[PDB]
Copies of this chain bind each other. A is one copy, B any other.
Amino acid sequence: GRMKFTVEREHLLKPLQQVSGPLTLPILGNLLLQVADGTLSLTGTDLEMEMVARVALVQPHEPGATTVPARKFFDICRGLPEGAEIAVQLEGERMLVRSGRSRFSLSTLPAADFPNLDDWQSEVEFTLPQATMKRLIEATQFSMAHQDVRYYLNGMLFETEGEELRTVATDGHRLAVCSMPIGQSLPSHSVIVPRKGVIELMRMLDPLRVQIGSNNIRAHVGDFIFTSKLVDGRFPDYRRVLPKNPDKHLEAGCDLLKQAFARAAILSNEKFRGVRLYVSENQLKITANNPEQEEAEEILDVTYSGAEMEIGFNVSYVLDVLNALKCENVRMMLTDSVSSVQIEDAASQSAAYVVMPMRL
C-alpha cells in the first residue's frame, strides 16, 4: 500500500495556499506530501527557506510520501466546489486526485529527492504576539536595500538585547530601527534575515514562537513552521548611525506634513526627487522645482525655536518614513544641512528613522 488520504477541501485550502508560496529546479516546484500518524504534512521549499504545514486527518488514510506540482495541486483544490471532499492516492508515477466526478492525474517526483535541512541547531528561543512581530517588520521593511552588492543590506537585522527584540534595515541613504519589549530575558544575538525570508514571515502573521539557529531562523505559527537561512556579513551598527546630538527639534502634525511633502513632490525632479526645507521660528517652508522650472511652495505652522536652516532631501525617502509612522505628531531632529536627520513619533521612541540629506 502507498500514501492515501481523504480530506475536506476547506481543511486543505489555507495550508496549501501558504506552503505554495516559497517555491527553478523541477522538484522545487513541487510540494512534499507526507502521511504519518494521523497527520498530513505539506512542505514547500526554494532550497534556502522552507514552509511546512500539518493537517489533521480525521478520515482513514495510509502512510507514505510523494512530491507533486504545487501550484497545480493548489489550483485544483481551490477550483473544486465549496464543501468538496478530496481523495488522493498514488498510481505509478502519478498522483490521482478525485472529488465528485472530477479526476486529476499529476506527475510526481520521489520524496527521497526532496531537500531537507540536516544541520539545524537552535541557539535562542522566545515567544511574542504576531502583532508585535508584524509591527517590528512593518516599521523597518521599506528601508532594506534592493539588490545591493553589499548582500547583507538586502535583508533585515533581527537582534535580541535585554528584554527587547529589535529590527534594523538600511540601504545606505536611510535607516530604520524598531525595538519592542517581549517580557522575557534574552541573550544578546544578532542575525540577518534575507529579504525573501522577511516577506514569507509576514505571510504567516495572519502567538509566534521563534528559534534563532546558528545559520537559520525558524518561526512556529499555529500548524505552520517556517525556516530560513540567515545571511552572512557584518550588518552596520545603528548606534553609530544615529545623529549624536541633534539639537534642533521640529515638531509637526504628521498628516499635514505628509500631505505638504506629497504635493511639493509633484514638481520635484523626477530622477533626483529633491525638495528644500527652510526651517524658521515655528514655521517650515517646503519648495520643489524641476528642469521645466516649475515650482511648488508649501508653508506650514510647526513647533521650532532653533536657528534658521535650509536642508535638502529626497522627498520619496521622507514620505516613506512619514507613511511608516502611525502617529499624530512627528519630531524631526536636525544638526546641520550636510548631516542626517532623525525622525520619530513625537509620543513614542519605539522606532527611529535616519535620512541623509542631499546637497543643495
Over the window 59-95 of chain A, the binary record of Cβ atoms lying under 8 Å from chain B Cβ atoms (1 yes, 0 no) is 0000000000000100110011100000000000010
* A295 proximal to B (CB < 8 A): yes
* A331 proximal to B (CB < 8 A): no
CA–CA, A297 and B75, complex, Å: 15
* A107 proximal to B (CB < 8 A): yes
- In the complex, the answer to whether A295 meets B80 with C-beta atoms within 8 Å is no
Q: Which residues in B have their C-beta under 8 angstroms from that of A260?
A: 102
Q: Of B81, B266, B298, which is within 8 A of A75 by CB?
A: B266
Q: Of B75, B79, B299, which is within 8 A of A259 by CB?
A: B79
* A360 proximal to B (CB < 8 A): no
Q: Which residues in B have their C-beta under 8 angstroms from that of A292?
A: 107
CA–CA, A101 and B297, complex, Å: 8
Within 8 A of B (CB), among A242-279: 259-260, 262-263, 266-267
Within 8 A of B (CB), among A110-152: none
* A2 proximal to B (CB < 8 A): no
Instruction: State the Cβ distance, A235 to closest chain B Cβ, in Å.
Output: 37
Within 8 A of B (CB), among A289-309: 292-300
* A198 proximal to B (CB < 8 A): no
CA–CA, A259 and B102, complex, Å: 11
Can you list 6 residue pairs at the A/B interface with Cβ under 8 Å?
A: A72-B266, A94-B294, A102-B299, A103-B297, A104-B294, A105-B294
- In the complex, the answer to whether B297 meets A79 with C-beta atoms within 8 Å is no
Q: Which residues in B have their C-beta under 8 angstroms from that of A296?
A: 102-105
- In the complex, the answer to whether A300 meets B105 with C-beta atoms within 8 Å is no
What's the interface size class on A, roughly? 20 to 34
* A3 proximal to B (CB < 8 A): no
Q: Which residues in B have their C-beta under 8 angstroms from that of A72?
A: 266-267, 294
Q: Which residues in B have their C-beta under 8 angstroms from that of A300?
A: 101
A295: nearest chain-B partner, CB-CB: B105
- In the complex, the answer to whether A76 meets B294 with C-beta atoms within 8 Å is no
| Other A-B pairs, 20, CB within 8 Å; known A102-B260, A104-B295, A105-B294 | A72-B267, A72-B294, A79-B262, A79-B266, A80-B263, A81-B259, A94-B294, A101-B298, A102-B297, A102-B299, A103-B296, A104-B263, A104-B266, A104-B267, A104-B297, A105-B295, A105-B296, A106-B294, A107-B293, A107-B294
Q: Which 3 A-B pairs have the closest CB atoms?
A: A101-B299, A79-B263, A103-B297
Q: Which residues in B have their C-beta under 8 angstroms from that of A293?
A: 107
A94: nearest chain-B partner, CB-CB: B294
**By CB atoms of chain B within 10 A, which of A266, A292, A297, A299 has the most?**
A266
A95: nearest chain-B partner, CB-CB: B294
CA–CA, A81 and B263, complex, Å: 10
A283: nearest chain-B partner, CB-CB: B101
Instruction: State the Cβ distance, A268 to closest chain B Cβ, in Å.
Output: 11
